[PDB]
Each structure stands twice: as structure tokens, then as C-alpha cells.
């Protein structure tokens with residue numbers, strides 16, 4: 001659903017606007033990840049995955 | 051399997067970032083879930099059940 | 101890179117409306133509010149003929165290649181069409197949805 | 201406007217049927233350049249007449265860096281005068297030429313997208329890799345690049361003659377677009 | 381109301397844009413001081429009372445990650461701001477910023493260009509952390525900048541004003557050895573080791589055919 | 599198609615009586631009733647791998663799929679022209695997909711392809727030029743910068759009134775066009791400068807950095823572009839005020855000859871000096887060269903006492919032939935191994 005940066009409720013298509021365009025009523029999944037880029041480890045926020 | 055295919059290079063070892071090839075694997079969750087509701091049959095693996 | 105087109109309204113003898121064309125509208129989308137019978141198509145649809153040919157990188161002969169394929173209203177009883185909308189899908193393709 | 205297109209640089213190569221040794225011709229000269237892991241031959245740099253002598257390990261040699269045609273010629277035998285110091289044959293026969301480059305200044309702003317739409321059936325360009333428009337003419341089989349500043353360069357011609365009659369042929373398509 | 385930078389309305393979420401700009405100016409200034417400073421795991425066993433001389437089954441294998449995780453714990457942690465990673469056409473392309481030249485360097489540049497004709501091989505190491513490519517371009521740009529000061533150098537075909545005698549030997553006092561014969565003597569050592577391993581090669585070969593001939597008899 | 603008695607050519611399928619027959623309008627003889635409705639291996643393998651690679655990058659770039667299958671036709675015939683051998687597989691599909699991006703005229707600019715493979719832009723555009731010459735693409739649309747505006751606004755996290763911020767922009771973009779700012783410059787450069795001016799005159803979301811985070815073009819190269827706009831003609835009308843409804847052309851001054859002013863019967867055939875007049879200047883002695891002698895290039899010769907001085911420095915810097923030697927000595931050692 002909502003992000004951790006903007007902290008708005010959601011930005012979304014309404015379902016009845018979605019059910020007549022053959023689309024899927026969806027909200028994206030967000031994760032936060034940390035890893036070794038190189039010289040050092042960094043953490044990254046709000047990655048889209050699905 | 052996309053990581054070590056990149057990391058099997060001698061020059062490509064220092065400033066490489068791995069996050070730029072996450073969008074190619076992103077929609078496998080989406081297109082898996084959408085046909086999992088559309089066509090009512092579930093191909094599980096840890097139970098192998100249909 | 102060939103589209104699908106909604107051209108329509110062929111004429112004959114000072115008159116556009118043939119017996120099959122009293123409800124096509126100016127846009128090709130059959131206009132909302134009047135009745136239909138057997139025959140009398142209401143969405144005029146044309147598809148190109150070179151659907152599976154290799155793209156020749158030139159601009160030589162693309163002027164007249166649309167074979168007709170409309171959608172006919174069958175049925176044993178004359179009906180009306182209630183409302184007609186058009187919009188776009190997830191990836192950008194034009195949609196046509198008319199409700200009888 | 202009766203302007204004159206000047207010519208900036210030549211190329212010219214000759215054969216040498218004598219085998220060359222890199223040890224005995226580079227290590228006792230003045231313009232000594234030989235790094236074998238960087239490059240497998242030697243460059244001479246004399247600045248009168250300001251041209252450059254490229255050699256090869258097999259023996260062949262190619263000169264580049266002169267304005268005039270005969271300017272390359274007089275140095276092409278002075279270059280082989282150094283290989284007359286070492287007891288080598290220096291059998292140069294054919295003074296062939298396969299590239300002469302020339303630039304001009306025509307000095308009026310032009311459109312470029314109109315002939316990219318009009319004369320787009322043969323020549324085209326892109327803005328985002330390079331700012332210039334590449335123009336081709338198959339009548340002498342030539343390539344050339346133009347600008348928006350009105351400067352036009354001509355390259356890729358083997359013969360010195362062939363730049364000339366091409367250069368007035370491209371003018372009527374160039375002055376076509378007066379940006380009305 | 382000039383078109384460059386009025387602060388004039390709501391301007392939502394500009395703070396993450398703000399300290400990114402102040403950090404990129406900080407990053408480039410630490411790149412300046414790298415330049416200023418440069419100018420200048422067997423197997424283990426144990427002895428049980430029950431079974432003496434027993435070897436540990438866990439030391440037989442190696443983990444190959446505990447050693448990596450020690451240094452990865454001792455790396456600096458930073459929080460990625462997705463504005464900081466911005467990239468343009470000037471990204472991932474070789475070439476860097478050349479440290480501009482000083483007049484103290486020119487007396488070591490003119491005279492090294494006065495002694496030889498134009499020899500880019502040995503003058504590269506004279507400027508110890510400059511490389512072969514940009515010093516060649518320093519010959520090229522000076523043709524338009526100072527065309528007449530260069531034109532005095534090739535007219536000079538004589539030993540110059542005799543002050544290079546120090547710089548003749550300042551080049552020589554690094555690793556003082558007779559290089560015309562230092563390379564010869566250890567190269568002869570190298571082929572001596574190769575000849576001895578070639579002796580070890582064939583003497584291993586002759587005993588091998590001798591031994592398995594005896595197995596062919598039996 | 600031809601009737602049996604009157605030889606008519608038009609047949610009309612009557613469908614009212616559930617027969618679905620075939621009959622002409624002229625005489626009425628049926629044609630046919632009772633309708634019959636229907637209820638190298640490595641060559642195939644090397645494109646099946648190439649299918650998934652086009653399937654790969656289309657997912658990450660949000661490409662609509664009707665370009666991916668169209669781009670497969672470009673790669674398929676460019677496979678036949680021996681263009682793929684030697685070059686990088688991860689490179690050659692990126693140039694192949696980008697062609698079908700501009701035939702469709704989408705918002706996808708080239709450097710977005712260069713970003714995720716983390717390579718230089720100029721490498722990807724190099725093989726793009728070396729491809730487009732070889733298989734002879736003649737017709738190809740221009741990269742109109744008008745496309746890029748209305749795609750930038752969605753990720754530009756601006757207010758709800760997102761249609762008025764692009765309507766005034768395209769008025770500025772058509773004002774950008776007839777004036778002489780972009781003719782040899784970059785599409786993404788000038789398309790990022792027009793949205794800069796429209797955003798500031800209603801909001802203050804522009805920070806010279808957020809639009810860079812979208813347009814991926816540096817900060818100092820766009821500062822010139824508004825100073826390019828400011829001092830051309832009639833811009834002092836539009837600096838402070840004047841609602842954006844001017845219809846004028848003004849002067850036409852591209853800067854490429856403004857810098858040139860800062861510096862300061864047709865032609866008959868045999869008026870230019872020829873090239874054979876210079877070929878016959880010096881006699882072409884193949885064995886001799888002793889007619890173009892001089893005295894300083896005759897003096898062009900080593901310092902004889904500074905020879906062993908100089909090669910000691912030359913041998914003091916060189917180690918490439920050193921490891922070449924024992925590797926050349928290894929060529930003989932591996933012969934008996």
C-alpha cells in the first residue's frame with residue numbers, strides 16, 4: 001500500500017473505474033532492502049516488486 | 051541466477067549495482083497471481099498438488 | 101505498425117443509408133438510441149491484410165489494404181442498444197464496449 | 201559567393217619491400233616512440249613540414265599530417281632518408297592517396313530538419329549522440345557532415361579532384377531552405 | 381522576476397532535494413585531497429582421553445563467509461537517498477579531471493622537450509602520477525597556445541644551458557644499478573632455472589618408463 | 599465464385615433461416631450448402647534465447663508488448679545479415695529494441711536503456727549508427743520533444759492540477775520550436791528546460807535537481823538554456839508578467855553564427871587548381887630520394903655518446919619484452935610437455 005516517504009493514504013484507481021477496463025484492482029508491494037553495493041553497504045527504501 | 055551470471059566477470063566486480071535488474075523479475079509475482087485467480091487451478095511445488 | 105480503423109457509411113444512389121447501414125453513425129460506432137434488427141451491423145471493424153508479413157523498411161504501398169469484418173446482431177427479436185463507451189486498456193489499445 | 205574550400209589533412213601510404221627491424225631504427229633516432237605493449241610500431245614527429253610518419257613492423261609506411269598534396273610528397277622521401285642511414289633498401293613505388301579532408305565556411309544559418317524530412321529517403325541523422333547532420337552523396341560515393349553554423353566539412357574522398365565537383369553539387373540543396 | 385531562483389510558493393518535498401545538493405559538493409572536495417596528498421586455516425585436531433589423536437569433523441570443512449562477514453560488519457553504513465544516484469551522459473565513461481599545470485613544471489617540461497625531440501615514454505615517469513595520454517595532449521594544446529615558445533626548441537640542436545646535469549642524474553639516482561647489464565644477468569638466471577626444471581622433466585620421464593616396463597614384464 | 603448459369607461473381611450469405619447457404623442475387627442457384635466449419639535446431643535455439651532477452655528488458659522498461667513482437671522481426675532479419683557475430687548480445691538487442699521504440703514514437707529515450715546495464719551511452723549509440731547504415735533504414739520519424747512533456751508530469755509529484763501545468767508548457771514548447779534554440783542541440787535538454795519554466799511560474803517544485811532526476815541531464819547545461827531563452831527576442835516581455843498568449847515570430851538568431859560574428863553563372867570546371875599539377879612537381883624516383891635533401895633532417899640522427907645513456911633509461915623503464923622472453927622460452931618448454 002502506502003509508502004514511507006510521502007506518507008499519503010494511497011494513489012489508486014477506483015474499482016468501478018477498473019472493472020470496465022479489464023484491468024486488475026491492485027496496489028503495489030513495497031519492501032526495504034540493504035546490501036553490499038561495493039566499497040560499503042547501503043540501505044534502500046520502498047522498492048517495487050509486484 | 052541473474053546475479054552470478056553478471057559476477058562471473060573480472061572487470062565487472064567493483065562499482066556494480068545489483069538493483070537495476072530487479073524489474074525483470076518483478077512481474078513474475080504479478081502474472082503468477084493473476085492467472086492463479088483467473089484459471090482456477092494452482093500448481094504448487096512444496097506439496098505437488100493440483 | 102498497422103492499426104484497426106472504424107471507417108464506414110458507404111453510399112448508393114444519392115443516399116448513404118443502405119438497409120444494413122441505418123445505425124452506423126458518423127464515427128463508425130453505431131449511434132445510441134435507435135432499434136436494430138437482424139443484419140444491420142453496429143460496430144464497423146476493418147483489419148489489414150498483411151497481418152503476418154515481414155516489415156519492409158519503406159513507404160510504398162499502404163493505401164488500401166482493409167478487408168471488412170463487422171459484427172452482426174443476430175437474434176429472433178428486434179432490440180435497442182443502451183449506451184456505447186470507448187476507453188483504453190492496461191497497455192494502450194483502444195477498447196469498444198457497447199451494451200444492448 | 202565564390203568561396204574556396206581549404207583542405208586540412210591528407211593520407212598517403214607507400215609499399216616497402218624491405219623488412220624492418222624495430223630495434224635498429226627506433227633506438228638511435230630523435231623522435232623515438234616504441235612501447236610494444238601499447239603499440240607495435242613507431243611514430244616520427246617532425247613539425248616541418250608538420251606531418252607524421254607512421255611505420256609498421258612488416259615494413260610498410262603511411263604518412264599523414266600535411267595540408268597540400270606536394271607538401272606530403274617532399275616529406276615522404278625525407279622520411280625515407282632516415283631509413284637510408286640504416287642499410288635498408290627503402291623500395292617505395294606507389295605514392296597512393298585514399299583520404300583527403302576539407303572544411304569550408306558558408307556563413308548563414310540554415311534549417312536542418314526540413315531536408316531531414318524532404319531528403320530523408322537517402323540521408324538522415326540523430327541529435328542525441330552527435331550535434332551534426334551526416335550527409336551522404338552516392339554520385340561520387342562520398343560522406344560528409346554539416347552543421348547549423350554554416351561550416352561544412354568534407355571527408356572520405358580518395359582523389360583530391362572528387363571533393364570539388366561534389367562541393368558545388370550540395371549547394372543547391374543547401375540553399376533550398378531560406379527559412380521563410 | 382528574473383527566471384533564476386525565486387523562492388515563491390509551496391514547493392512540496394524539496395528538503396530531500398536540498399541536502400543532496402550540499403552532499404555532492406562535499407563529495408567532490410574530498411576527491412581534491414586524494415590528489416593533494418598524492419602530489420607530495422589449516423585442519424585442527426585434539427587429544428581426547430577416550431579417543432586420542434582424533435581430528436575435528438567441523439574443521440575439515442570451511443565456511444567461506446565468516447571471514448567475509450567480519451570486514452562487512454566493519455564498513456560504514458549510509459542511508460540511500462534516491463535523489464543522490466542521479467546519472468547523466470557523463471557517467472560510466474573513461475576520462476577524468478586533469479590537474480592543471482604549473483610553471484614550476486614547465487622548466488622540467490621545456491628542458492625535457494629541449495633535450496630530446498619529442499619522446500613521451502620517459503617524460504611520463506618524470507611526472508610520477510601523470511599518465512601517457514594527457515601529457516601527449518599537453519603537447520597538442522600548446523601548439524595553439526604558445527606556438528612560438530615551442531618553435532625555439534627544435535631550432536636548438538646542441539646541448540642546452542648546462543643546468544640539466546642535476547636532472548640528468550636525478551633521473552639516474554633512482555635505483556642505482558647498471559641497467560645495461562643488470563637485465564642480462566638475471567635473465568641468464570631465469571633460463572638456468574628453466575634448464576634445471578627441464579632436467580627435472582626428462583629425469584622424471586625416464587624413471588617412469590623404467591618402472592612400468594617392469595610392470596609389463598610381471 | 600462464378601455461378602453455373604448466369605456466371606455471377608457476387609455471393610451473399612443468407613443467415614436468417616439457420617441454413618447459412620451461399621447464393622447469388624442474380625438467378626438464385628445455391629453454390630454450396632451444408633457449410634463445413636472447423637470446430638537448424640541451433641538456429642531455433644539461438645532466437646529462443648533471444649526471445650527471452652527481448653522479453654526481459656521489455657518488462658523492466660514498461661514496454662507495451664506490441665513493440666516486443668515487432669522488434670523481434672528486426673532482430674530476425676538482422677540475424678541473416680551477419681551483423682550479430684562478434685558484437686555483444688546484451689548490446690545488440692538494446693539497439694534493436696530502440697528502433698521499434700521510435701517507429702511507434704514512444705517516450706522512451708535511449709539512455710534509459712544504457713542505465714540498467716551500467717555501460718556508457720556512447721557505446722550503445724555507436725552500434726546503433728553502425729547498424730542503421732548496414733540494413734538501410736531510410737524512413738524514420740524525428741524525435742519530437744513534444745512527446746516528453748506529458749510523460750514527465752506523472753513522476754514529477756506535482757499538484758492535482760496536472761493538466762494546466764502541461765497545457766501552458768506545450769504553448770511554450772511550440773514557442774520553443776519556431777524560435778531558434780534547438781536545431782543541433784539535445785531533445786532531452788530543451789524538453790527539460792520548457793517544463794522548468796512552466797513549473798516555476800505556478801509552483802516552486804523545481805529545484806534544478808528533481809527535473810534532473812527525471813530528465814537525467816546535468817544541472818549546469820540547463821542553466822545556459824534559460825539564459826539562452828532570456829536574451830534572444832521579446833523575452834523581457836515574458837520575464838515578469840504578460841499572460842502567455844503572444845503569437846509572434848520575431849528574429850531568427852541561432853547562437854552558432856552569433857559566435858561566428860564574434861570572431862570577426864555557376865563555377866566553370868577548369869578554374870580550380872587541379873591535383874595532377876602537384877603530382878608532377880617532384881619527380882617520382884622510386885629508388886632515389888637525393889633531390890629533396892636538406893641539412894637539418896640530414897643532421898636528424900642520434901647523439902652517439904648519449905646512446906648507451908639513453909637505452910639504459912629505455913631498458914630501465916621496459917619489462918614487456920622481459921616476460922615475453924620466458925613466455926617465448928615457454929613456447930619451447932610446452933613442446934616437450
Ligand SMILES: [Zn+2]
Pocket residue numbers: 601602603604605606622624625626627
Ligand atoms: Zn447465378
